[PDB]
Ligand binder design. Structure first.
Ligand SMILES: *Cc1c(COP(=O)(O)O)cnc(C)c1O
Ligand SMILES: *Cc1c(COP(=O)(O)O)cnc(C)c1O
Ligand SMILES: O=C(O)CCC1CCCCC1
Lengths: 388, 394
């Protein structure tokens, strides 16, 4: 029977990591100057506290633990958290949150379509393909200016219908690094409420852009305008617990009744997929978020990380300017997040990794974190050498 | 849009505990629990498990993304724990999953990919979640006779006659050991006949292995699985580490796909990794790392095996006591099955009506199908349960 299985296409980004003066600018993980993805101080302290206070490992909450649900809701929505109208589901990483979000939505609307940014995280489409959900794209990245083609985005978004789902990145857009301003967010909210489309927000880098609260400004604005909204959050990066697989799905509803419905469907969704959600990571997160001492140190380390990447961008951009006499590459310093799309065509991108030893994703997506004073000039020189 | 959601039913377990907690009776007993409780009514963390977590806290230097199908140490250690020396690496695909339930869901998805017209045969009765998942997936579900409500043993003749109707490509779900909820199990000779039926019908066996070590022993509990693995070319095994490692909440499981050849193994392994990636990308690391640590560290493995065996022996002694008590009160050997049943659960064979009478009159709570958890009994509660059963006329 199993012989009937068809060979499935592998994950490109992961494959890139597989095929690796080597400079890795692939997989989206944070790395320090010494090419290491460390364990945050607070996270480590949390685990120690856990190893000491936990007396049992029996089954817990099907939708996650109340403390985790609360801490996460507050981190994302701040004071805009209306408990009586929000449903929370602890999931297996942000990816699990997205999948659970797509399933939940399809249950309420079998005829739903999903609008995704052009371009977007390849996994978004992959999952949607697997599920067989109709995917539509909205213009987002402006290939010339490397910014956002807002006019084009608004045009296509207006074409959405009631019941359609629009997938927006809360901040730090993967793979481009191009992000909307708060003003642009307000406009998008106008379009959404006029069309009756359900926004699905992918929040995976809250804290890597402009700051913890700042990176949630957009998500908070949509939540305040639109009555029903879905938020798929990931703790993989901002907490550095990638392998623990911890994130959550928040369902913002119009009333308590609907909320009781959503919470019921969300729980049922975990039950039929894997029963209970993984505990270890969620515990680290809530422990950190509820322990003032740990929260303060976590915010600080995350701040240090964010500030550092920001420096690297200004450094890489400057190196480029003083190597071209033109601020064409200036956008690198304007982009916010962990990634940034250079624009190098497929021809050039593979050529670079070949005759330079620097591995980046085919669409020219580079991981700023995987760069330092030593490699910056090399990358700058590289893209200058192979200008076309 | 979300208002168009259909109401989904609660897990019921909560509702079961709801009534229990509201009971003002000081002598109320709870035998409906589905996890292991010790003498003091606690579900402890195993010594070896606590030791592994300390070692992990000291040696892990990063939490970066790891293996999409799980870590090699875990996949191999698990494969050896289940199939022992009979592990054919060249033809065995392995996938780390989110608990045994995740292993079952993935196995069902894998089979469906290979055969859209798949039909699943489940025992009568079986773990409720089995049916729920299949219903959710919309897969055709068939039932084969299993529990003989009269002897409280296996209705093997009926099982054979029903499995005979399975066609090539159909899936037959068997409990590797310690049948949940019944407690009645197949003998190695019956496993042999079953294997013959499967070879004949061309049905794909899906073995649910969640209680390895709670029956007759670690090796003993895998006997049937190993017999199936050697006779049948394609086999799917959904293993769980929740109970036998006491890491319920960590969500640690494993899906083993035994294939006919290397070409097929690579095909299955690829499909399995694709399945994880499309559901949640990478599987939970912590629980799996605790397991691989225990299994690879000679000191820990020895201690774990010893703690598990003590737990197993403990439950067995309880079965003997209960049955002995029941024999004295009944003046017969009708309830001898209690000491024959293996596992943590046992179906007494009481009707809902009798189950209700026991709750009301004796304050003893159990699942509506009369499933009891042997772990919830002790020298003080056994006499009470014995009398309750007899008085209500089970
Ligand atoms: C990281 C990331 C996710 C979620 O990843 P998990 O490892 O499953 O937490 C989702 N979307 C984007 C854009 C990401 O970069
Ligand atoms: C407990 C159990 C499982 C798996 O539980 P997980 O918590 O998901 O590991 C699977 N099948 C049966 C029959 C069980 O009793
Ligand atoms: O590189 C990125 O886009 C972030 C990490 C992702 C890569 C694809 C699998 C899930 C994790």
């Amino acid at each position: 029977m199993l012989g009937n299985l068809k060979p499935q296409a592998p994950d490109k980004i992961l494959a890139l990591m597989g095929e690796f003066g080597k400079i890795d600018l692939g997989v989206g993980v944070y790395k320090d100057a010494t090419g290491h993805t460390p364990i945050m101080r607070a996270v480590h302290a949390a685990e120690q506290r856990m190893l000491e206070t936990e007396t049992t490992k029996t089954y817990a909450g099907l939708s996650g633990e109340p403390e985790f649900q609360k801490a996460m809701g507050e981190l994302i929505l701040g004071d805009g958290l209306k408990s009586e109208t929000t449903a929370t589901l602890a999931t297996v990483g942000g990816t699990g949150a997205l999948r659970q979000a797509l399933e939940l939505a399809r249950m309420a609307n079998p005829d739903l379509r999903v609008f995704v940014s052009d371009p977007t995280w390849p996994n978004h489409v992959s999952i949607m393909n697997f599920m067989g959900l109709p995917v539509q794209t909205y213009r987002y990245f402006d290939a010339e200016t490397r910014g956002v083609d807002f006019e084009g985005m608004k045009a296509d978004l207006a074409a959405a219908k009631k019941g359609d789902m629009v997938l927006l990145h809360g901040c730090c857009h993967n793979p481009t690094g191009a992000n909307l301003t708060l003003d642009q967010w307000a406009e998008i909210a106008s379009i959404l409420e006029k069309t009756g489309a359900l926004p699905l927000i992918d929040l995976a880098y809250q804290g890597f852009g402009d700051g913890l609260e700042e990176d949630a400004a957009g998500t908070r604005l949509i939540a305040s305008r639109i009555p029903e909204v879905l938020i798929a959050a990931s703790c993989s990066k901002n907490f550095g617990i990638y392998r623990e697989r911890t994130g959550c799905l928040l369902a913002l509803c119009a009333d308590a009744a609907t909320r009781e419905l959503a919470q019921g469907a969300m729980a049922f969704l975990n039950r039929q997929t894997y029963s209970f959600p993984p505990f270890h990571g969620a515990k680290i997160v809530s422990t950190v978020l509820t322990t003032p001492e740990l929260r303060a140190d976590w915010m600080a380390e995350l701040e240090a990380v964010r500030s550092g990447m920001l420096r690297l961008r200004e450094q890489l951009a400057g190196e480029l300017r003083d190597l071209s006499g033109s601020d064409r590459f200036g956008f690198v310093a304007e982009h916010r997040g962990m990634f940034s799309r250079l624009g190098a065509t497929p021809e050039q991108v593979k050529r670079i990794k070949e005759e330079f030893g620097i591995y980046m994703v085919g669409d020219s997506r580079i991981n700023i974190a995987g760069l330092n004073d030593n490699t910056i000039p090399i990358l700058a020189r590289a893209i200058i050498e192979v200008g076309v």
